[PDB]
């Protein structure tokens, strides 16, 4: 067939026909025209139309939507958009027949956040978008910080474990097939989970342009094609579009990120951005369209010499498959190999050499903030690789990425410009999982269920169609008085300690609220321990095997010491720490059986140091802190609070469940001139989810004093409040002086320590 009059229509002539290798004979001839380049010149103005040209400077071009983007500048005495002053867009100004502002997502592979520092000298168009619209210092990608997991997260609002694109390469045991960047496999829909934006738009009557472009199509052509689609009549014209460039990723890989030879790739991108905004301007759409400039991840210095080889750790390297590079994923090469021992492989990869540039984890043991476990495509054995290094199986580029998503070099960019974004507004860094909701809002769509926190980015937008509401409590507490007698047992405040309201329990159970001089708790009669414990340590506070029963609680719903005596490997700790009692009288409350939780001795080293040393330090640095601590049960590693039937471990012979993790949420006043308990304004929060492990193999220095390794462990396991909420089915910060959207922003904050 032929593509005459069908080039880039919505034999094939569409922008993906190369990829599926299926275009017409003259697709290349007709559609990928390059003649005379991409720029109009004085001598071309009002030319007779010449069909061989790449773009046009004829009088009829605007109507066809196929002018070169500088046509009006060169041929009609108009200004480049970038040369125009910033002017506020208080409402969308759209041509006749437009019914919503269109969205254009301008995506740049490997665009590291720091690249913005290069500034309006190198990137004048981008810098104006940034300065004039809404921006953040950076945007955090998802882990693995690779292209495919991050593009589909942007599209879906989901963690890779949920959307299914767990890596650029993956093996699915159910399919028994592997997915790769190169190959036809990736086109099969079976790999792609969730509901991406283009489908959300279609299902709700909003027409979507294409989001993907064959590598063959030049960037200038991608822009021209989008601009031509925007000239289509109402019933044919999409409301949402995406541009993509493999730059500056491609050049990052060749030259590394910090090079002076990154200046030219960055100006070539800014040129394409300028083509887009000039193009929009001449179609009178530059104050109609919302534009998102966004990257998928950053870029780090990585060279051939900085490679760890598994062959130098494992004697049986030929019996394993490794997904290599800036992360590692290991599985048995052969199906029925009884010589395959993952316990042995992990031990063989643990703290073997002094400078070792990777750490092995079973996936359930990865920091919970990475949300990287609940998929059959994620191998049990993972290697978190040190920034600047690769790992390969056995023994041309200066850059790579893929590392832990809190690493500074992996951060990427966000800018929103247009009628629905705010004007000259800076917002705090946020995570790319949150954008799908925003893009939905920008298009009047109801988002499909996702991992963004809808409302947390309302501060990016001039107007908000979506108003978040706090979830309703699913179980009300009890407030027991003395209902029992010491002889009963066979064992063997608010103003001070609860500063943001009681956490709401969002599932069916039975729990009691408990008051004490030093702390308040919500005790669960199902799990035989608190779901949370809340206490406040003032800046100027002091640090200095009794277990006694709790009168307010039936022996039926209390733990016993005998169970710990009998469990050889399990000890116990306390959620409110005796070391922080206000008085020796108060201190006996800290030894109640209702304050007690099961802890491995190895973990007690971590927990005791946190409670006895770090909490004081934090209270000293931040002008007091409020701490809320508790247990987490996540045996199926889905990131969600477990029901009883999922719990796979109990204190021996008992019905006391063993937690997979212990959390803390540590809050103070952002205005540190105010104490934590007398804070008028915005809050400051840091949180962790510590794995409750029977050894400290994760910490290669753990034979040293706790001051040399505990805090590093805790920083690695930093978390968002939101992460803890999912894991506990609790809702926090319900009674503050702040708006609920502001609190949603606060619950999504991650303290990174970078
Ligand atoms: C990230 O967001 C996703 C999507 O909201 C969450 O995954 C969803 O999790 C729920 C709870 O397990 C699943 O609900 C189940 O849905 C099926 C119907 O498909 C129903 O038969 C079950 O009774 C239950 O209601 C849901 O399928 C699942 N959706 C997706 C796309 O995975 C996920 O939990 C979030 N992750 C975190 C850590 O918050
Ligand atoms: N086109 C393209 C390609 C990728 C991307 C297309 N978009 C646009 C986008 C925007 C918003 C959104 F929700 C989802 C997607 C991207 C956006 C980001 Cl942030 C990252 C990567 C990409 C691409 C296509 C083919 C090939 C190949 O090897 O054949 C390689 C890459
Ligand atoms: Ca769970
Ligand atoms: Na014991
Ligand atoms: Na150790
Ligand atoms: Zn990428």
What is the Cα Rg of the chain in Å?
A: 29
End residue of a domain, out of 432, 466, 500 = 466
Same domain, 486 and 426: no
Q: How remote is the CA of residue 599 from the centroid of ligand 4, in Å?
A: 9
Contact 60, 30 (CB under 8 A): no
Determine the Cα–Cα distance for residues 456 and 636; give it in Å rounded to an integer: 28
* Distance of alpha carbon 474 from alpha carbon 504, whole angstroms: 8
Q: What values do phi and psi take at 674, rounded to 5?
A: -110, 140
Task: Provide the CATH number for the domain around residue 602.
Answer: 3.40.570.10
Return d(Cα 107, Cα 242) in angstroms, integer. 7
Pairwise CA distance, residues 146 & 410, whole Å? 9
On whether the CB atoms of residues 719 and 749 are closer than 8 A, the answer is no
Instruction: Round to whole Å and give the CA distance between 338 and 334.
Output: 10
Examine the fold and report which residue of 466, 497, 516 is the final residue of a domain before the chain moves on. 466
Judged by DSSP in three states, 226 sits in: helix
Question: Which atom of ligand 2 is nearest to 243's Cα?
Answer: 8
CA of 244 to the centre of ligand 2 (A): 6
72, 91: one domain = no
Distance (Å, whole) CA 605 – CA 513: 29
The angle formed by the CA atoms of residues 619, 625 and 629, to the nearest 5 degrees, is 115
Distance in angstroms (rounded) separating the CA atoms of residues 662 and 599: 10
Helices 740-748, 721-728: axis angle to 10 degrees equals: 90
462 sits in which H/E element: none
472 and 462 together in one domain: no
Whether 453 is a known active-site residue: answer no
What is the Å distance from ligand 2's center to 530 Cα?
A: 46
139 and 20 belong to one structural domain: no
**Among candidate residues 21, 46, 78, the one where a domain is terminated:** 78
Distance CA 737, CA 623 (A): 19
* Per-residue DSSP letter, 65: T
Domain region containing 608: 467-754
Query: 351 C-alpha to center of ligand 6: Å?
Result: 31
Distances (CA, A) of 331 to 191, 322, 328, 544, 680: 20, 7, 10, 49, 53
142 CB near ligand 1 (under 6 Å): no
Tell me how the structure was determined: X-ray
**φ, ψ of residue 744 in degrees (nearest 5):** -65, -40
Residue 221 shares a structural domain with residue 354: yes
- Residue with the two structure tokens 């934090």: 618
Q: Which residues, including other chains, have CB under 8 Å from residue 482's CB and lie 6 or more apart?
A: 551, 552
Regarding whether 700 and 666 lie in a shared domain, the answer is yes
Is residue 490 helix, strand or coil? coil
Looking at 147, 200, 210, 420, which residue is catalytic? 147
Q: What is the DSSP letter of 460?
A: G
207 closest CA partner among 292, 92, 99, 294: 99
Q: Which residue has the tokens 């498959």?
A: 321
DSSP reduced 3-state for 240: strand
The C-alpha atoms of residue 747 and residue 250 are separated, in whole angstroms, by: 36
Where in 525-622 does DSSP place strands (E)?
Answer: 529-537, 571-574, 596-599
- Residue 327 has φ and ψ, to the nearest 5°, of -145, 170
Both 452 and 501 in a single domain? no
- Mark whether 304 and 185 lie in a shared domain: yes
| For the CA of 246, the nearest atom of ligand 2 | 31
The DSSP string of 145-193 is -SHHHHHHHHHHS--HHHHS--SSSEEETTTTEEE-SSSSGGGSGGG--
| Separation CA 690–CA 246 (nearest Å) | 38
Contact 500, 534 (CB under 8 A): no
- Would you say the CB of residue 328 lies under 6 angstroms from ligand 1? no
Check whether residue 436 and residue 475 sit in a common domain. no
Burial class (CB in 10 A: 0-12, 13-18, 19+), 458: buried
Compute the distance between CA of residue 361 and CA of residue 358 in angstroms, rounded to an integer: 10
How many domains, in total, are found in the chain?
A: 4
Does the CB atom of residue 601 touch ligand 1 within 6 A? no
Per-state percent for the chain, helix, strand, coil, to nearest 5: 30, 20, 50
**Binding site residue list:** 109, 147, 168, 249, 253, 296-297, 401, 634, 636, 638, 640, 642
Q: Is 623 in the pocket of ligand 1 (CB under 6 A)?
A: no
Question: Which residues carry a binding-site annotation for Ca(2+)?
Answer: 634, 636, 638, 640, 642
One domain for residues 300 and 156: yes
Substitution site in 16, 142, 151, 443 for ligand 2 pocket (most atoms within 8 Å of beta carbon): 151
* C-to-N gaps above 2.5 Å in the chain, after residues: 10, 395, 492, 544
Residues 399 and 341 occupy one common structural domain? yes
Quote the DSSP letter at residue 105.
E
DSSP characters for 95-156? -TT--S--EEEEEETT-BGGGGGGHHHH-HHHHHHHHHSEE-S-EE-PSS-SHHHHHHHHHH
- For residue 296, the ligand 2 atom closest to its alpha carbon is 19
> Resolution of the coordinates in A?
1.8
Q: What angle do CA 417, 421, 422 make, to 5 degrees?
A: 105
What the block records as the tokens of 272 is 């394409």
Length of the chain: 754
Is it true that the peptide bond before 248 is cis, omega within 30 degrees of 0? yes
CATH number, domain of 121, equals 3.40.720.10
Q: Report yes or no: 141 and 410 within 8 Å, Cβ to Cβ.
A: yes
Residues 506 and 381 occupy one common structural domain: no
């Amino acid at each position: 067939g032929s593509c005459k009059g069908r080039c880039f229509e919505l034999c094939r002539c569409d922008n993906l026909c190369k990829s599926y290798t299926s275009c017409c004979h003259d697709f290349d001839e007709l559609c990928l025209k390059t003649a005379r380049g991409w720029e109009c010149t004085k001598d071309r103005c009002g030319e007779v139309r010449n069909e061989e040209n790449a773009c046009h400077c004829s009088e009829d071009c605007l109507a066809r939507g196929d002018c070169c983007t500088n046509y009006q500048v060169v041929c009609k005495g108009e200004s480049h958009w970038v040369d125009d002053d910033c002017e506020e867009i208080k409402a969308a100004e759209c041509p006749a027949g437009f019914v919503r502002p269109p969205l254009i997502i301008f995506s740049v592979d490997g665009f590291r956040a720091s690249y913005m520092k290069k500034g309006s000298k190198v990137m004048p168009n981008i810098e104006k978008l940034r300065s004039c619209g809404t921006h953040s210092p950076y945007m955090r990608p998802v882990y693995p910080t690779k292209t495919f997991p991050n593009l589909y997260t942007l599209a879906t609002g989901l963690y890779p474990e949920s959307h299914g694109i767990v890596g650029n390469s993956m093996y699915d045991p159910v399919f028994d097939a592997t997915f790769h960047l190169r190959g036809r496999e990736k086109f099969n829909h079976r790999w792609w989970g969730g509901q991406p934006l283009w489908i959300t738009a279609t299902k709700q009557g909003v027409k979507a342009g294409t989001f993907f472009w064959s590598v063959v199509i030049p960037h200038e052509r991608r822009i021209l094609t989008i601009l031509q689609w925007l000239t289509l009549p109402d019933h044919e014209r999409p409301s949402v579009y995406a541009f993509y460039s493999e730059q500056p990723d491609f050049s990052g890989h060749k030259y590394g990120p910090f090079g002076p030879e990154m200046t030219n790739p960055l100006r070539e991108i800014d040129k394409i951005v300028g083509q887009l905004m000039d193009g929009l301007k001449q179609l009178k759409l530059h104050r109609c369209v919302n534009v998102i400039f966004v990257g998928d991840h950053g870029m780090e210095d990585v060279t051939c010499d900085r490679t760890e080889f598994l062959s130098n750790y494992l004697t049986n390297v030929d019996d394993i498959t490794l997904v290599p590079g800036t992360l590692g994923r290991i599985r048995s090469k052969f199906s029925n190999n009884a010589k395959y021992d993952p316990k042995a492989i992990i031990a063989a990869l643990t703290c073997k050499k002094p400078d070792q540039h990777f750490k092995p984890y079973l996936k359930q043991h990865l920091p919970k903030r990475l949300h990287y476990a609940n998929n059959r495509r994620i191998e049990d054995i993972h290697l978190l690789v040190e920034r600047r290094w690769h790992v390969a199986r056995k023994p041309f580029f200066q850059g790579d990425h893929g590392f832990d998503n809190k690493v500074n070099s992996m951060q990427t960019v966000f800018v929103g410009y247009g009628s629905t974004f705010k004007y000259k507004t800076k917002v705090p860094p946020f995570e790319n999982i949150e954008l799908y909701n925003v893009m939905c809002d920008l298009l009047g769509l109801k988002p499909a269920p996702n991992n963004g926190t809808h409302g947390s980015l309302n501060h990016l937008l001039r107007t908000n169609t979506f108003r978040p509401t706090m979830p309703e409590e699913v179980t009300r507490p009890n407030y027991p008085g003395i209902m029992y007698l010491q002889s009963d047992f066979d064992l063997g405040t608010e103003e001070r300690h609860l500063l943001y309201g009681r956490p709401a329990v969002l599932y069916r159970t039975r729990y009691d609220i408990l008051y004490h001089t030093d702390f308040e708790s919500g005790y669960s009669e199902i799990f035989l321990m608190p779901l949370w414990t809340s206490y406040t340590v003032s800046k100027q506070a002091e640090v200095s095997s009794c277990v006694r029963p709790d009168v307010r609680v039936s022996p039926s719903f209390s733990q016993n010491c005998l169970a710990y005596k009998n469990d050889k490997q399990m000890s116990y700790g306390f959620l409110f720490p005796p070391y922080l009692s206000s008085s020796p009288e108060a201190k006996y409350d800290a030894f109640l059986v209702t304050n007690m939780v099961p802890m491995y001795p190895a973990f007690k080293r971590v927990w005791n140091y946190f409670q006895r040393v770090l909490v004081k330090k934090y209270a000293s640095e931040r002008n007091g802190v409020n701490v809320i601590s508790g247990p987490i049960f996540d045996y199926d590693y889905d990131g969600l609070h477990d029901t009883e039937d999922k719990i796979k471990q109990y204190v021996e012979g008992s019905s006391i469940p063993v937690p997979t993790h212990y959390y803390s949420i540590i809050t103070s006043c952002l205005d540190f001139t105010q104490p934590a308990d007398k804070c008028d304004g915005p809050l400051s929060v840091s949180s962790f989810i510590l794995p409750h492990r029977p050894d400290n193999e994760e910490s290669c220095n753990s034979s040293e004093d706790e001051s040399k390794w505990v805090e590093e462990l805790m920083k690695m396991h930093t978390a968002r409040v939101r992460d803890i909420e999912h894991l506990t089915s609790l809702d926090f910060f319900r009674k503050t002086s702040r708006s609920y959207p502001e609190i949603l922003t606060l619950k999504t904050y991650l303290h990174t320590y970078e």
